């Protein structure tokens, strides 16, 4: 009954659109919803030399890859969540539904 | 002159002694080396040097048994044997007097030629 | 380019024409006199024969040895 949706995405606006649709999907069906908890975004970092050889001035590229995690708690029966979460997802976002 | 000993132990006392008891006598590197377990890989070439160990012919100096093994321990069991330590190029004829115990056969070989300086 | 030592050759296989006749002895009647020992290993039942060397017996693929 306490069902915990984990929205993890690389993009923010796709993740904010999905978590906004899951608040509208929880408000229209009138089930009690703990708000989307913004988790601390993880910046995956790789700093390589630019040069494929060793013969320039030592320039470095610094590749970030931000991963944003939200999570939403619902007071909802199982099959109601199975219907909600299966509708209108966009491929940037990864959705993991925890039953209990 | 006097009867040489390792740590505080006579050579025949060293020689009729188990590996487990011989461990507690020499330095910690050689304890580690021989405690890891008996040697079954291409380290059963160590076990094949045990066969070359058990091939001392009657009364003279024995013939040279050659080794591409520089990580081999000079056991008291080995002492008296004539060994050819491989430099990578040449087998150096090395006898092992009983004060070599603990050390490795490879270190005794020069491996690298000494370096005089032209200019 | 030119090297010092003379070359090493490969082992040439000493191939035998009709090597099957040696393993058996034909009788005057329709029977046999099997010369060389049959392999007692589990892999090969009673079909595979052992080697008959000068001072011991040996089988090839199961790699089984019997000294006198």
């Amino acid at each position: 009954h306490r069902i915990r949706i984990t929205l993890t995405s690389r993009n923010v606006k796709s993740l904010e659109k999905v978590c906004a649709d899951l608040i509208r999907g929880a408000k229209e069906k009138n089930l009690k919803v703990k708000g989307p908890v913004r988790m601390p975004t993880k910046t995956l970092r790789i700093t390589t030399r630019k040069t494929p050889c060793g013969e320039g001035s030592k320039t470095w590229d610094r590749f970030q890859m931000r991963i944003h995690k939200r999570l939403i708690d619902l007071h909802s029966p199982s099959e109601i969540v199975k219907q909600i979460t299966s509708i209108s997802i966009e491929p940037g976002v990864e959705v993991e539904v925890t039953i209990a | 002159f006097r009867k040489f000993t390792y740590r505080g132990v006579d050579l025949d006392q060293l020689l009729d002694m188990s590996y487990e008891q011989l461990m507690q006598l020499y330095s910690a590197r050689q304890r580690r080396r021989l405690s890891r377990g008996l040697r079954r890989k291409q380290h059963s070439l160590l076990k094949r040097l045990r066969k070359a160990k058990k091939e001392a012919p009657p009364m003279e100096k024995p013939e040279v048994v050659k080794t591409h093994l520089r990580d081999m321990i000079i056991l008291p069991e080995m002492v008296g044997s004539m060994v050819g330590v491989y430099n990578g190029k040449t087998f150096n004829q090395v006898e092992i007097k009983p004060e070599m115990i603990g050390h490795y056969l490879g270190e005794f070989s020069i491996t690298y030629k000494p370096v005089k300086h032209g200019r | 380019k030119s090297y010092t030592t003379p070359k090493k050759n490969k082992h040439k296989r000493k191939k035998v024409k009709l090597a099957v006749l040696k393993y058996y002895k034909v009788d005057e009647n329709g029977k046999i006199s099997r010369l060389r020992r049959e392999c007692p290993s589990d892999e090969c039942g009673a079909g595979v024969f052992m080697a008959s060397h000068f001072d011991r017996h040996y089988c090839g693929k199961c790699c089984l040895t019997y000294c006198f």
């Binding site: 790789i46 970030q64 | 890989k41 | -």
Partner: protein, 55 residues
Amino acid sequence: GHQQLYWSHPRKFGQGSRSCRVCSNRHGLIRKYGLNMCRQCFRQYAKDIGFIKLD
């Protein structure tokens, strides 16, 4: 036998064990986050993986 010598030297650790998953070469490896991918390959495929230059 030859099968007892062909691959008998251990490949359990060191930069003679792991290699680039593209180049197949043994140098400048990005092991971080299980890329297992040499630094010139990563610099080619960064965009395709999701790595972006911002700051």
